[PDB]
Amino acid sequence: VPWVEKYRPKCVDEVAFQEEVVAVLKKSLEPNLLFYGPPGTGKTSTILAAARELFGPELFVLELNASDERGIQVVREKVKNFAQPPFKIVILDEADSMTSAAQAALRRTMEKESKTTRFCLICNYVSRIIEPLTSRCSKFRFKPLSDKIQQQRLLDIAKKENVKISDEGIAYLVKVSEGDLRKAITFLQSATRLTGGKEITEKVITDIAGVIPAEKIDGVFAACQSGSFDKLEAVVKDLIDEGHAATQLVNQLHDVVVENNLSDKQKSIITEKLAEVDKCLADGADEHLQLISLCATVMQQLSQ
Amino acid sequence: WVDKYRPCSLGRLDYHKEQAAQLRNLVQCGDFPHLLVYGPSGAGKKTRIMCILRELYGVGVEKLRIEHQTITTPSKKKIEISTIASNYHLEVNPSDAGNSDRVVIQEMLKTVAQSQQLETNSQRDFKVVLLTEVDKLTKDAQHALRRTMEKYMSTCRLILCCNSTSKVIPPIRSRCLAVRVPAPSIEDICHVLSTVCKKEGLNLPSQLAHRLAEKSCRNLRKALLMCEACRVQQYPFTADQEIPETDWEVYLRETANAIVSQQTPQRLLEVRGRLYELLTHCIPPEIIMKGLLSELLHNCDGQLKGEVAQMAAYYEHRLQLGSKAIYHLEAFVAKFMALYKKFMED
Amino acid sequence: NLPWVEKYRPQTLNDLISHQDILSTIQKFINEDRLPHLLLYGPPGTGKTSTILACAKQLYKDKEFGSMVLELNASDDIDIIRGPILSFASTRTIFKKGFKLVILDEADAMTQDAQNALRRVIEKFTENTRFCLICNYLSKIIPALQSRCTRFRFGPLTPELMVPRLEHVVEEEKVDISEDGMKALVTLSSGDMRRALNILQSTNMAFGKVTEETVYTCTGHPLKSDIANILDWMLNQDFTTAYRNITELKTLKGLALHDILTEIHLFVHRVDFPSSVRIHLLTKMADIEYRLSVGTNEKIQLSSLIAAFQVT
Amino acid sequence: YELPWVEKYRPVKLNEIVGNEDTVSRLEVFAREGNVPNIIIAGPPGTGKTTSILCLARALLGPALKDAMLELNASNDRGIDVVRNKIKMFAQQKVTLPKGRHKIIILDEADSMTDGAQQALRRTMEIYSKTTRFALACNASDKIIEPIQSRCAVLRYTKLTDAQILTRLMNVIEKERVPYTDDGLEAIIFTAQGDMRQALNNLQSTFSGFGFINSENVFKVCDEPHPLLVKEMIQHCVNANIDEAYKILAHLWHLGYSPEDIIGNIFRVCKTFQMAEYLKLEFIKEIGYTHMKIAEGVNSLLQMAGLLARLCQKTM
Amino acid sequence: KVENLLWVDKYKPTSLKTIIGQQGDQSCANKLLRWLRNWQKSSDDGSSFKAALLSGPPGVGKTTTASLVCQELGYSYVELNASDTRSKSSLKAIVAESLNNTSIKGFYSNSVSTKHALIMDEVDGMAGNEDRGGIQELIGLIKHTKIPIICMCNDRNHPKIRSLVHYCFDLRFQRPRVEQIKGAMMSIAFKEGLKIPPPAMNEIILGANQDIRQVLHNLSMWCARSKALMGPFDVARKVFAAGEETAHMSLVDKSDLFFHDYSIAPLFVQENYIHVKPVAAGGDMKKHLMLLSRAADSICDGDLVDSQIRSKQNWSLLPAQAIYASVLPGELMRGYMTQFPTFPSWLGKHSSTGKHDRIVQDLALHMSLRTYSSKRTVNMDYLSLLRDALVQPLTSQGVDGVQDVVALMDTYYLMKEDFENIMEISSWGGKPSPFSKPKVKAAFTRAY
Numbered sequence A: 001v002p003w004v005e006k007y008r009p010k011c012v013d014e015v016a017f018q019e020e021v022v023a024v025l026k027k028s029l030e031p032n033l034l035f036y037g038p039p040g041t042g043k044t045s046t047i048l049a050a051a052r053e054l055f056g057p058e059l060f061v062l063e064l065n066a067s068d069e070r071g072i073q074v075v076r077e078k079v080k081n082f083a084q085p086p087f088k089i090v091i092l093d094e095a096d097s098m099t100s101a102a103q104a105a106l107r108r109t110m111e112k113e114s115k116t117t118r119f120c121l122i123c124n125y126v127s128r129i130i131e132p133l134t135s136r137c138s139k140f141r142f143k144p145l146s147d148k149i150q151q152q153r154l155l156d157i158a159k160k161e162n163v164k165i166s167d168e169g170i171a172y173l174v175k176v177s178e179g180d181l182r183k184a185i186t187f188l189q190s191a192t193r194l195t196g197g198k199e200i201t202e203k204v205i206t207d208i209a210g211v212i213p214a215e216k217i218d219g220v221f222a223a224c225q226s227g228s229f230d231k232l233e234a235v236v237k238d239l240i241d242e243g244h245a246a247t248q249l250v251n252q253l254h255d256v257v258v259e260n261n262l263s264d265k266q267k268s269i270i271t272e273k274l275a276e277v278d279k280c281l282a283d284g285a286d287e288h289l290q291l292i293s294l295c296a297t298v299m300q301q302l303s304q
Numbered sequence B: 001w002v003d004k005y006r007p008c009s010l011g012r013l014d015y016h017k018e019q020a021a022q023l024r025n026l027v028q029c030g031d032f033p034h035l036l037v038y039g040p041s042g043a044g045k046k047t048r049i050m051c052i053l054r055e056l057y058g059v060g061v062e063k064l065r066i067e068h069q070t071i072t073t074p075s076k077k078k079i080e081i082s083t084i085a086s087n088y089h090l091e092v093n094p095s096d097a098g099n100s101d102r103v104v105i106q107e108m109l110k111t112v113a114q115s116q117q118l119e120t121n122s123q124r125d126f127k128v129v130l131l132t133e134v135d136k137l138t139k140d141a142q143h144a145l146r147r148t149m150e151k152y153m154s155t156c157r158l159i160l161c162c163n164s165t166s167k168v169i170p171p172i173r174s175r176c177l178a179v180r181v182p183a184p185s186i187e188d189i190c191h192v193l194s195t196v197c198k199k200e201g202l203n204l205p206s207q208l209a210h211r212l213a214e215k216s217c218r219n220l221r222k223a224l225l226m227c228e229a230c231r232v233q234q235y236p237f238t239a240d241q242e243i244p245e246t247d248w249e250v251y252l253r254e255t256a257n258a259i260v261s262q263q264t265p266q267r268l269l270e271v272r273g274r275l276y277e278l279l280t281h282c283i284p285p286e287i288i289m290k291g292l293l294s295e296l297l298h299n300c301d302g303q304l305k306g307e308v309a310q311m312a313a314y315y316e317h318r319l320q321l322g323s324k325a326i327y328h329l330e331a332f333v334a335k336f337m338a339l340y341k342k343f344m345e346d
Numbered sequence C: 001n002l003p004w005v006e007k008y009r010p011q012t013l014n015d016l017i018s019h020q021d022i023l024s025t026i027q028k029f030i031n032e033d034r035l036p037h038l039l040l041y042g043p044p045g046t047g048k049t050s051t052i053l054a055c056a057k058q059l060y061k062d063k064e065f066g067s068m069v070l071e072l073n074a075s076d077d078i079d080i081i082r083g084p085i086l087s088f089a090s091t092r093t094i095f096k097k098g099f100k101l102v103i104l105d106e107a108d109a110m111t112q113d114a115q116n117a118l119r120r121v122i123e124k125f126t127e128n129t130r131f132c133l134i135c136n137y138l139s140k141i142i143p144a145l146q147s148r149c150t151r152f153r154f155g156p157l158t159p160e161l162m163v164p165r166l167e168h169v170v171e172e173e174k175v176d177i178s179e180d181g182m183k184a185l186v187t188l189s190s191g192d193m194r195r196a197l198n199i200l201q202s203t204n205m206a207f208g209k210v211t212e213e214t215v216y217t218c219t220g221h222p223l224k225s226d227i228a229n230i231l232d233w234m235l236n237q238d239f240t241t242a243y244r245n246i247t248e249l250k251t252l253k254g255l256a257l258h259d260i261l262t263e264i265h266l267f268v269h270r271v272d273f274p275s276s277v278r279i280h281l282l283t284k285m286a287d288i289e290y291r292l293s294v295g296t297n298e299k300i301q302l303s304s305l306i307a308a309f310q311v312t
Numbered sequence D: 001y002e003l004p005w006v007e008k009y010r011p012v013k014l015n016e017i018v019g020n021e022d023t024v025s026r027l028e029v030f031a032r033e034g035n036v037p038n039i040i041i042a043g044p045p046g047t048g049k050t051t052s053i054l055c056l057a058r059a060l061l062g063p064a065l066k067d068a069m070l071e072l073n074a075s076n077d078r079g080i081d082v083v084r085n086k087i088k089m090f091a092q093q094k095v096t097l098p099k100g101r102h103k104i105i106i107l108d109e110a111d112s113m114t115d116g117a118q119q120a121l122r123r124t125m126e127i128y129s130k131t132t133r134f135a136l137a138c139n140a141s142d143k144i145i146e147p148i149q150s151r152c153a154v155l156r157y158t159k160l161t162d163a164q165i166l167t168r169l170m171n172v173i174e175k176e177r178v179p180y181t182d183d184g185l186e187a188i189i190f191t192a193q194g195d196m197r198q199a200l201n202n203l204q205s206t207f208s209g210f211g212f213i214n215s216e217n218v219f220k221v222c223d224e225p226h227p228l229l230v231k232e233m234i235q236h237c238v239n240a241n242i243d244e245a246y247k248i249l250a251h252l253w254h255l256g257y258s259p260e261d262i263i264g265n266i267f268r269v270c271k272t273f274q275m276a277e278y279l280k281l282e283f284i285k286e287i288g289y290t291h292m293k294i295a296e297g298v299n300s301l302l303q304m305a306g307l308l309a310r311l312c313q314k315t316m
Numbered sequence E: 001k002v003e004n005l006l007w008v009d010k011y012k013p014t015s016l017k018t019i020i021g022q023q024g025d026q027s028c029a030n031k032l033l034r035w036l037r038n039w040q041k042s043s044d045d046g047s048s049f050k051a052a053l054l055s056g057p058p059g060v061g062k063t064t065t066a067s068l069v070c071q072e073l074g075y076s077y078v079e080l081n082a083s084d085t086r087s088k089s090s091l092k093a094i095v096a097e098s099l100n101n102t103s104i105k106g107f108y109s110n111s112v113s114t115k116h117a118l119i120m121d122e123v124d125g126m127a128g129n130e131d132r133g134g135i136q137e138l139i140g141l142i143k144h145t146k147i148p149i150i151c152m153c154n155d156r157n158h159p160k161i162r163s164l165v166h167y168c169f170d171l172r173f174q175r176p177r178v179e180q181i182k183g184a185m186m187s188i189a190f191k192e193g194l195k196i197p198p199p200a201m202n203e204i205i206l207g208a209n210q211d212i213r214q215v216l217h218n219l220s221m222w223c224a225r226s227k228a229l230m231g232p233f234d235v236a237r238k239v240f241a242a243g244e245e246t247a248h249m250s251l252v253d254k255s256d257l258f259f260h261d262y263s264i265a266p267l268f269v270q271e272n273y274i275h276v277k278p279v280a281a282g283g284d285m286k287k288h289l290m291l292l293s294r295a296a297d298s299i300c301d302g303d304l305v306d307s308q309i310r311s312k313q314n315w316s317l318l319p320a321q322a323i324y325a326s327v328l329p330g331e332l333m334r335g336y337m338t339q340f341p342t343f344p345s346w347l348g349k350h351s352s353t354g355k356h357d358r359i360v361q362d363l364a365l366h367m368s369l370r371t372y373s374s375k376r377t378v379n380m381d382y383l384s385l386l387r388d389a390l391v392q393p394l395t396s397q398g399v400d401g402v403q404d405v406v407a408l409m410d411t412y413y414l415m416k417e418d419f420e421n422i423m424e425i426s427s428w429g430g431k432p433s434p435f436s437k438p439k440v441k442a443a444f445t446r447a448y
C-alpha cells in the first residue's frame, strides 16, 4: 500500500492537529459536512477516519469526484443508485470545480435525498461553492501543518521505512513541495524506489518534484538582463532541450519577479505577460514560442 | 539502421546512465508505479520505455503485433485506431481520434484490465498501457484517464510518453512518477555516432561527427538519420561533406527566404501555395511556425526581432484555437510582410 | 424537520406574489377555457412550478390528478417524446371529459431533435392535451417550439414585494431577525424566494439568530470589509506587500479569485475613479476572468490583477 | 374550441405565400406543368416550408391527395425499419394519376432522420422515381447526408423582409379587425425576426390577452430587453461615458435578463444604428468577441462591463 | 405531352461508351470490364480477387458502371441495396445459398446466358443495429464464392470498409473533369431545347462539385426558372465590389450576403480576398499590404467563431461570424477584383491531407519492428530516408536495385503497394520522383 495511506490517521482525535474539526466530528451523528483547505492537509483522511470510527471496518461510503468528464447527470444518478448507522456517507472531491448550474442540480439531488445519505463536500475554496450548498453544510477549514512538524513527520516516516536521507534533504523535500504533506510523502516514497535505499540526494528530489534548478532561472534572468535576442534564443532552446515544462518556468519566474526589488511598473508589466503566457500555454500553445515571447518582453523591460 | 543499434537493456544505454540505474532499481523493487516519461523529441523516451519493459517482463515483450480496433463516437461517426500490442503490454496513441479521445481511453483501459484477468502469470501481476503523445489529449479525455487510471490501478500500469508536460492536468502529474529524459549533449551524440560507425566499421572522422551533432540540434534520431544519409551519397567521409537535410526542412527554408525576398501580394499568393504544400504533407503547424520564425529572425534586425517573435507566438496561440490552420499561417505571413516592408522602406 | 420552503408554499393562485399581471391573465384563461400551451421561463426560485400547480389544482380535482396530469422532468433523458408523452397526449382518459395537462419541468435540457418531435406532438394534439413547458433559459429553446406557445417571463422578485412575505414568515415562526439581517438576507438571496427562505431557515436553525454577520458566516459569502481591505492593499501599497497581504487573506478564509474579482468589480464601480481609470480596471478585470476560465494558475492571475490595479 | 390564427389563415395555394418570390415561382411552375423532382426545401423556421410543400402536393394531386401522399413528421417512427417497409411499400404501391402526376412522400423535418434511415432511403428515391416523388423539408441542410442531397433539388429559403411580414399582418388584421397602431406593428416586426409564424403568434396572443395592439403591450407579452434601453446604452458608450452606460447595463441585469439575451439585443440594435461606419464596425467587432466569450460560458456581469469599457475606449 | 420522367432517367447512360466519367484505356469501367470478362480464370493485377470494390464520390456513375458492365457481358446480377436488410443472419439466409449455385436465368431466358453475378450496392450503409454483422458475413462470403461479387462503397476510408478492401479489387472513381461534363451537359441541354451560356454551365458544374446527378437536377431547376419567366460565385464576387453598392448596401444587406449559403461563403471570401486592389490604397503597396494583413486578421477571427459554432450547436453566433468573415474584409478590401471568384479549393486540400495522412500512417504501421510514431514528421523523415535508400541502389546500379529493394521491403515489412505509396508521397513542389529519372522497372514489377 502507498505511504500516503499507510500513515493516515486512524481516529478523529488522534493526530489531526486541527482541533475544532475533530471535536465536532464526534457529534456529527447543518446536516452535511464541508471541508475546505489547501491540498494535502488531511481533508479526505479525516472523514475516512470518522467513517471508520462511526461505521466500522467491515461497514464500508461512496467516494467520487465532482470534476468528472461525464457531466453532472451521471454523478447525481450514481448518488441516487448508492442511496438504496441510519445513513450512508458520500464524498465529493473537487466540489469547487462544479459550475453554478451543476451545483444547482447537485443541490436538488442532495435535498431530495436528505433522509438517508449524508454528504461531504471537499474543496480548496469555500467561496466557489454556491450559497445553498454551503448554507446546508457545516464548514471546516484545514490549515497546513507547520514547517517544523512537516520535517518531524517526514523524519518519522524515513525512520519507520529506513530511508537514509540527509536532514537538509528533508528540508529541501518540504521546501520543493510547499506545505503539501501528501505530496512530500509521495515524493519521499517514489524517490527511494529511484535509488534502492543507497542514498537520496537533493538532485533526486529536484528531479522528482519537477522543479527546474534555480541555476537555470538565474541564467534566464542573466540573458534577458542585457543581451541580444540570440542569447534569449539560446537559453530558451537549452531550457526546452532539458525537458523542463514551460509551466514550471513561468511559475518560478513569477515567484522570482514578485519578491525581488524590481520596480512596480516593471513588475506589473512582467506579471501581466506572465499571466498571458500562462493562459496561452494552458490553451495548448507551443512552449518554445511562448517562452521566446515572454523572454522578449522581460528583456525589453529589464534592458531599458 | 536507426532501429538496428538502439539498445534493448537498461545496462546497454549510451547516455543518462545514472537515470538508467535509477529506472533499473525502480523496476526491481515491487509495486511498479504509473510512469510519466517526458523530454524533448528524439532524446530516447521510447528507447528507455522499451528497456523498462524488457526489464519488467521477459524478452517476449518484443514479439509484438498490430491490432486495429474500432471505436464509436456519441453518434454514428465510427473511427478506427491502431494499437501496437504485445503479450504483456499495449501501446495505443489515443489522440488520432481527434475529439473522441475520451472513449478510446476508457475502452482500451477496460479491455486491457479484463485481458489481464485472463491468467497473467508470466512474471508480473499487471500489464502496461503505454499511451504516447499524451500532452495532446483533450481535458475531457485527461479527466477520463485520471479516473480509469485508478479504477484499474491494481491490474494495469500506465506509462504516459509525452513531451513538455505543460498541458498535462496536475491531477495526472500527481499520480505518476515523473521521469524526465533530457536531450543528449553534443558530446553524447558524437560518441554514439562514433560507436555506431565503428560497429558499422566506417571511418567517421572527428570533424564530421561534430557537424552532424551541431546540425541535429540535440536530436539523436535526426543525427543518426543524417549520418546514414551522408553515407548513401558519399561513403568516403571527409571534413566538408554536404550532409543532407529532409525535404520539408528545405521547403520551409526556401518559403521563409521567399517571404523575405518580396513583399507583394503576388508573392503572398505563392507563399499561400507553399503553406498548402506543407500542410498537405501532414507536418504540424507549430513546426511550420517555428521553422519559419527561425529563418525569418535570421533575416531581420535586432530591433525588429521582438515584434516578430511576439507575432509568431500570438498567431500560433490563436491557431491552436481555430480549425483551419492555413488561415492563421497566412495571416501571420501577411502581417510579417506588412511589418517588414514598412520597416525596410522607412 | 419540515423545510420552510415547503410549509409556506402558495396553495392557491392568489397567494402568488409579484406577478399579478401574469396571474390575472392565466386566471382569465382558466375561466374561459382558452388555456393555451404555456412557456414559463425565468431565474430559479421565482414561482413557476407553484403557479402551474395551483392552476392545475384549480382546473382538475385531486383524484383526477393522477390520470390527467403528466408531471415530467426533462433532465432525466427523443424517446421520451414518442414514448410516454405521445402515448399520454393522444389517448383520452376513460370517463373524464376535458383536456389533459403535460408539465415539462426543465424544458431546456432537451436536445433540439427532441424539441422538433415535441413541437409536432403539440401541434397535432392541441385540443385534448395542453402542454406547459418550464425553463430558465428561453434562449436554449428552439424558436420553432417556443413559437407554438405563449411565453411568460417570471423575473426575479423585487425586495419590496418579497419583504412582507418574509415578515409574515418571521412573525408566524419565532425568528429574532435584526433590521439589517433582513437586508443581508434579501441581498444574498438575489431575488428568489426559495433561496431566501432556505438561507433564513438554515441560519436560524444553525446559529439561533439572524443578523448581518450570522448570515454572512452561514453562507460563506465574502464580507464587504474584506474586499475593502483587498482593494486598499491593491490601491495604497507596494506590489509585493500587496501580493503577500492578499495571498494571506485569500488562504486564511476560503476565497477563490472569481469571488474576489466579482466583488472588486462591484467596488470599482462603487468608489470614485477618474472615469478613465475604471475603463482600464474594467478591461483588465474582464480579461483576468476569461484567463481564469480556462484552468490556469491562480498565483499568476492574482499578480496580474495587482498589476491591473497598479495603474494608480 | 377555436383554432389559432397560425392555422385559420394558413395559405391554401402558392399564390398566397409571401416568402421567396423566386422559389415559390419555381414551385408554381411545377404545380402547372406537373413533373416535380425530389425537392429538399431548406431554410430558417417559420418561413413557409411545410406550407409550400403541402400546397404544391395539393395543387399537383388534387382529390387523390388522400391516396397519393404520405407524410412522415418528426413525431412518427422513421427508423431504418420504417424506411425499409412502410416507405418502400408506398413507393411500390400502384396509384393511377393523370399524365404527369406522381405520388409524393413528404418527409418533414428531414434533418431529424438518423443516417441509417437516409441510407436506406437513397435507393427508394432512385428506383421508383418513375411514379414516386419525394419532398423533404429541413432547417439545417447539412444534417441530410450527401447522397440524399445528390438526388434532390436543394431549394433554399431565406428570412422574410419586414415588408412581407407587414403585408401578411395587415391581411390578417383586416379580416380580424383588431385595433392596432404603428408602434405596435413595429414592435411585432422587431420581435418576429423574420419568422412569419412567430409574428402571427405574437399578434394573436397580444390581441387575446389585451385587445389593442401598441408597443407597450407587445413588450408585455414578449418581454425582451426593450430596444430603447439598449439604444440609450449604446449611445452612452458612443460618447465614451462608461458610468452612464453601466447604469443601464446594471438596470437590465437587475430584472434578470440572461446575458445571452442582452447580447442578442445589443447586437441586433448596434447593427441597425446611427453611428459612423468605421465606428459601427469597431463596435460590432467587440460585441462579437464578447458574445463568443459568453457563449463559451463566461457569462458574468464583469464581462458585460468589460465590453462596455472596450466600447468606450474605442472612441478614446 | 407531359413527361413522367426526370432528366436523371431520360439521359441515363444506356450504353457503356456513354459513361461521362471514364472512357479511357484503363479506367474504372474498363478495368472492371476486363476483371469481369476473365473472372473465370480467378475461379490491372486484380485477377487474383473474387470481388470488386467501386468506391468514390457520389453521383459519378458507380451504380451505372456496374449495371452496364454486368449487362454488356451478358451477366445477370442480383442487386442488394441499402434498403434491403443485410444483417448477418439475413445475409447468410438470403445470399449464402446463391453464391455457389446456378442461376435460373442461366437456363430459362425470354438469349439464354450463364454467368450470374452479385452486386452489393451501398456497402457502407450496412451500419447500425439493423445490419448487425453485415460486413463480417460479407467478407466471409467473399472468401468462399463462385460468382463475381461487385461491392460498391462511397468512402473507402471507413472503419467497417477497411476490413473489406483487403479482399476486393479496389477501384476508385474520380470526379470527372469539368470539360467532359461540360460537353455532355451541353449536348443534353441542346437535346432539350434549353440555351445556357457556357460560363453559366461551368458555374453550375463547379457549384455542384462535378456531381453529374446534381448538375442534371440543377439543369432541370434552371430550365424551370427559365420557364418561370444568386449563386455562390455571384455573392462571392458581390462582396468585393465598389461603385454600385455604395447606397445599395447597408450593414443588414452586407451581413445577409453571408446568409445565402452560409456554409461556403467564408471559404469563398478567404480564397478571393487576395486578388483585390483596395481603392482606399491608391497603389501605395505599404497600405495595400496593411489592408491585406487586417483582412487576414478578420478572417482568422471568423475561423475562431466557426470552430466555436461547430463544437456546440449554438446557431446564435452566425451573425458574429458573418461580421468577422464576410462583412469586415469587405470594408477593408473594397477595391476591384482582378480575375474571377475562383473556387475555395480548401475542401480538396483537406481531402488530400486526409489521404496523405492515412497513407503515411499505414506505411509507418508496417515499420513497427521496435519504432513507431503514428503519423508525425518523425515518420515523414524515416520515409524520406527510405525513399533515398531504395532509389540509391537502382540509381547507381541496375543490378542491385532488386536485391536492396527486396532486402528493405522485407526488413521493414513492406510491399509493392507500399513502394508506390512511398514514391509519390515525398514530391515537393510538383517535383518528379527520383524513380522516373527505365528498362529495369518493367522487370522490376514482373520479378518482384
Ligand SMILES: Nc1ncnc2c1ncn2[C@@H]1O[C@H](COP(=O)(O)OP(=O)(O)OP(O)(O)=S)[C@@H](O)[C@H]1O
Pocket (backbone or CB within 6 Å): A003, A004, A005, A006, A007, A008, A009, A015, A016, A017, A018, A038, A039, A040, A041, A042, A043, A044, A045, A046, A145, A181, A182
Ligand atoms: N493534519 C494532519 N493530520 C494527520 N495526517 C495528516 C495531516 N495533514 C496531512 N496528513 C497526512 O497527509 C496525507 C494526505 O492527506 P489527504 O487527506 O489525502 O490530503 P488531501 O486533502 O486528500 O489532498 P488532496 O486530495 O490532493 S485535495 C495523509 O496520508 C495523512 O497521513
Ligand SMILES: Nc1ncnc2c1ncn2[C@@H]1O[C@H](COP(=O)(O)OP(=O)(O)OP(O)(O)=S)[C@@H](O)[C@H]1O
Pocket (backbone or CB within 6 Å): C004, C005, C006, C008, C009, C010, C015, C016, C017, C018, C042, C043, C044, C045, C046, C047, C048, C049, C050, C051, C135, C136, C192, C193, C194
Ligand atoms: N411568488 C411566490 N409566492 C410565494 N412563494 C413563492 C413565490 N415564488 C417562490 N416561492 C416560494 O419558493 C419556493 C420555490 O418556488 P418554485 O415555484 O419551486 O420556484 P421554481 O420556479 O420552480 O424554481 P426552479 O423550478 O428551480 S426554475 C416555493 O415552495 C415557495 O414557497
Ligand SMILES: Nc1ncnc2c1ncn2[C@@H]1O[C@H](COP(=O)(O)OP(=O)(O)OP(O)(O)=S)[C@@H](O)[C@H]1O
Pocket (backbone or CB within 6 Å): C144, D005, D006, D007, D009, D010, D011, D016, D017, D018, D019, D020, D043, D044, D045, D046, D047, D048, D049, D050, D051, D052, D138, D139, D168, D196, D197
Ligand atoms: N411565407 C409565408 N406566407 C404566408 N404565411 C406563412 C408563410 N410562412 C409561414 N406562414 C404562416 O405560418 C404558418 C406556419 O408556417 P409553416 O409552413 O409551418 O413554416 P415552416 O417552414 O413549417 O416552419 P418550421 O417547419 O417550424 S422550420 C402557416 O400556417 C402560415 O399561416
Ligand SMILES: Nc1ncnc2c1ncn2[C@@H]1O[C@H](COP(=O)(O)OP(=O)(O)OP(O)(O)=S)[C@@H](O)[C@H]1O
Pocket (backbone or CB within 6 Å): D147, D150, E007, E008, E009, E011, E012, E013, E018, E019, E020, E021, E022, E056, E057, E058, E059, E060, E061, E062, E063, E064, E065, E153, E154, E212, E213, E216
Ligand atoms: N459518368 C456518368 N455519365 C453519365 N451519366 C451519369 C454519370 N454518372 C452519373 N450519371 C447520371 O447520374 C445518375 C445517377 O448516377 P449513379 O451511377 O446512380 O450515381 P452513384 O455513383 O450511384 O452515386 P451514389 O450511389 O449516390 S454513391 C444516372 O442515372 C445518370 O443519369
Ligand SMILES: Nc1ncnc2c1ncn2[C@@H]1O[C@H](COP(=O)(O)OP(=O)(O)O)[C@@H](O)[C@H]1O
Pocket (backbone or CB within 6 Å): B002, B003, B005, B006, B007, B012, B013, B014, B015, B039, B040, B041, B042, B043, B044, B045, B046, B047, B048, B192, B220, B221, B224, E371
Ligand atoms: N542509449 C541510446 N543509444 C543509442 N541510440 C539511442 C539511445 N537512445 C536513443 N537512441 C536513438 O534514438 C532513436 C529513437 O529515439 P527515441 O528513443 O524514439 O526517442 P523519442 O521517443 O524522444 O523520439 C533510436 O532508434 C536510437 O537510434
Ligand SMILES: [Mg+2]
Pocket (backbone or CB within 6 Å): A043, A044, A045, A093
Ligand atoms: Mg483527498
Ligand SMILES: [Mg+2]
Pocket (backbone or CB within 6 Å): C048, C049, C050, C105
Ligand atoms: Mg420548480
Ligand SMILES: [Mg+2]
Pocket (backbone or CB within 6 Å): D049, D050, D051, D108, D137
Ligand atoms: Mg414545418
Ligand SMILES: [Mg+2]
Pocket (backbone or CB within 6 Å): E062, E063, E064, E121
Ligand atoms: Mg448508386
